[PDB]
Ligand binder design. Structure first.
Ligand SMILES: Nc1nc2c(ncn2[C@@H]2O[C@H](COP(=O)(O)CP(=O)(O)OP(=O)(O)O)[C@@H](O)[C@H]2O)c(=O)[nH]1
Ligand SMILES: Nc1nc2c(ncn2[C@@H]2O[C@H](COP(=O)(O)CP(=O)(O)OP(=O)(O)O)[C@@H](O)[C@H]2O)c(=O)[nH]1
Ligand SMILES: [Mg+2]
Ligand SMILES: [Zn+2]
Ligand SMILES: [Zn+2]
Lengths: 173, 168
C-alpha cells in the first residue's frame, strides 16, 4: 500500500451521483481520485476505467488527443452499467508531467511522433506506475475487475501492476 | 518574476487554435498554463479570463459548482472576440488543494459552509500577473462577474482597465 484514502464526498453529475474518493501518496503527498457509481460491493466483478489525467484533453477541449472523449465515454458506460469505478490517475503526460507534454507537442509541431518525442526529452514511451491504481482498488475494497479499454496491451500491464482483471470491455469512442 | 515560460505548442480546439504556453514556478516547480487566442500584440487592452483550476468542475462534470461552465463560457467569449487569453491558474480549491476541497465538500455534506482550518481565499494572484508579463501583456479587460475580483487582481499587480461580464 503506497496510498491512503483521506476523504470522500458526493459528486453530483448529469449521470447522477458518484461517490468521489480522495487518495494521497504516502511518500509524495500527491493526490489521485476515484469516482464510484452505484454499489460496488458484491462478489460480482466491477466495471472500471483507469483514466490517466490529461489536462488539455480532459479540461481544455483539446482536439489534439481524445482523452476528453474517452473520459466522457467511460463515465457514460459506467452510468449505463449502474455500478462501476473510474480511477483518475493523476500522472500527466504518461507520468512525465504537463510541461513535458507541452514541449513534446512543441516537438511534434515539427514531425516526430510520441515515442521519439520523449526519448529526446529523456523519457521512455510510458513512465507510468499503475501499482498506485491497484492500491486505489484495494482501498475501495475491489478485487475482480472488468476493465474498460480498447487496448489489449493495457490489460497485460494493469494486471501486471497487480490488478485482478477478469474481463475486458471496449470503449465507445 | 516568480515564474518562467518553459514551452508552447499549438492547442487545437472546437473554437480554433490556441497557443498554449507552459509556465513553471521558479521556487516550487509547480506548473500553470495559458491559452492564447489570436494576436495578443498591440496597444489594445487584451481580453482575458483568470480561471482557477477546479478538477471536479473542469474535468469531472461536477454540478456541485459551475467551474466547468465558466471555463467553457470564457473560451467561447474569447473565441468570439478573436483575441484573448485564459490563464489556467493551477491553485486547486482556492489554493488549499484538491484533497482539502473534497474534505470541505465532505463537511458541506454535513453542516458547515464554504467558510469553515484555512481562510476564505488562500490564493496568490501575483503569479497570474507574472504570466501576463511573460506573455508581454499590460492592459487587461478582465472577464468576470465578481467586481471584487478586479480589486484583488489589480491589487496583485494586473493592470485591469475594464471588467467584462462573463455570460454563461
Ligand atoms: N508524452 C505524451 N503523452 C501524451 C500525449 N497525448 C496524450 N498523452 C498522455 O497519455 C495518457 C493517456 O494516453 P494513453 O495512450 O495512455 C490512453 P489510456 O492510458 O487511457 O489507454 P487506453 O485505455 O488504451 O485508451 C494521458 O496521461 C495523457 O496525458 C502525447 O502526445 N505525448
Ligand atoms: N473551499 C472551497 N473552494 C471552492 C468552492 N467552490 C469553488 N471553489 C474553488 O474556488 C476556485 C474558484 O472559485 P471562485 O468562486 O473563487 C471563482 P473566481 O475566484 O475565479 O471568481 P470569478 O472571476 O468571479 O468567477 C476554484 O479553484 C475552486 O476549486 C467551495 O464551496 N469551497
Ligand atoms: Mg474558476
Ligand atoms: Zn491527451
Ligand atoms: Zn469548482
Amino acid at each position: 500500500m503506497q496510498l491512503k484514502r483521506v476523504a470522500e464526498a458526493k459528486l453530483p453529475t448529469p449521470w447522477g451521483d458518484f461517490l468521489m474518493v480522495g487518495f494521497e501518496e504516502l511518500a509524495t503527498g500527491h493526490d489521485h481520485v476515484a469516482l464510484v457509481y452505484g454499489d460496488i460491493s458484491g462478489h460480482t466483478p466491477v466495471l472500471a476505467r483507469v483514466h490517466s489525467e490529461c489536462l488539455t484533453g480532459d479540461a481544455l477541449f483539446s482536439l489534439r488527443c481524445d482523452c476528453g472523449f474517452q473520459l466522457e465515454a467511460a463515465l457514460t458506460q459506467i452510468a449505463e452499467e449502474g455500478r462501476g469505478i473510474l480511477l483518475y490517475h493523476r500522472q500527466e503526460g504518461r507520468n512525465i508531467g504537463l510541461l513535458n507534454k507541452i514541449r513534446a507537442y512543441a516537438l511534434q509541431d515539427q514531425g516526430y511522433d510520441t515515442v521519439e518525442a520523449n526519448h529526446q526529452l529523456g523519457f521512455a514511451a510510458d513512465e507510468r506506475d499503475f501499482t498506485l491504481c491497484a492500491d486505489m482498488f484495494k482501498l475501495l475494497g475491489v478485487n475482480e475487475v472488468r476493465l474498460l479499454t480498447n487496448n489489449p496491451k493495457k490489460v497485460e500491464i494493469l494486471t501486471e501492476a497487480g490488478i485482478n482483471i477478469v474481463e475486458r470491455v471496449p470503449l465507445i469512442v
